[PDB]
Amino acid sequence: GSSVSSVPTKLEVVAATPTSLLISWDAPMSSSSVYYYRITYGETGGNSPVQEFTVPYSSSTATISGLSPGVDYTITVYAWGEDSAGYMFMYSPISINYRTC
Amino acid sequence: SLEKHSWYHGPVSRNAAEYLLSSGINGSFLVRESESSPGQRSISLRYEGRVYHYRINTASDGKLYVSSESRFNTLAELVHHHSTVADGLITTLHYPAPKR
After folding, report:
1. Among A33, B11, B14, B83, which is most exposed with the fewest C-beta within 10 angstroms?
2. Which residue of B15, B54, B91 to mutate against A (max A Cβ within 10 Å)?
3. Which is it for strands B28-33 and B8-10: parallel, antiparallel or unpaired?
4. Chain B positions touching chain A (beta carbons under 8 Å)
């Protein structure tokens, strides 16, 4: 019986400047075994290209810069954990749409 | 043939991958055959001194992938892709581990 879980479980975003966002998510349970997060962002819809970066598991916030004022972006945060066999896996990710201004 | 590629190590164990990556740097990696499930391949990837192990999945239509959204017809295409963008890996695939 294959299963997946949502990690992170809450994602908050706010415009920092017309060209940047502050984002934050919930720190994981220790039981989730998270090793890093991948953050992606790009224009909303149509499986459009994303820029991406990773932060370590000890982070629960990031900034995203170089955005276009007013443009709708989709921000997604993925969590990668390590299973009992010593292999990495992806939790089900969280996403939000947002724009500066 | 796959064995021509320095990144392709064939049947080596998880512990052997630690040895093969011992004097690696960030992005040093190898593709190997998994002992926890045969016919299955894995990427072992060094980052900040730790080795991370990823299953290479085979889709029902034969394509290969680490991340579900990015599937490829061949292992070479998969390695090429993840050498330019991490796309789920902790870092990009950079330097093949030396073979021993």
Report:
1. B11
2. B54
3. parallel
4. 14, 36, 42, 52-55, 67-68, 85-88, 90-91
How many inter-chain contacts (A to B, CB under 8 Å) are there? Answer: 32
Q: Specify the 3-state DSSP secondary structure of B51.
A: strand
Our CA angle for A63, A18, A58, nearest 5°, is 10
Report the structure determination method: X-ray
- Per domain, the residue ranges of chain A are 1-101
Structural resolution in Å = 1.8
Please name the fold of domain A1-101: Immunoglobulin-like (2.60.40)
Q: Is the dihedral of CA A32, A37, A39, A40 positive or negative?
A: negative
Supply B49's token pair: 């001194």
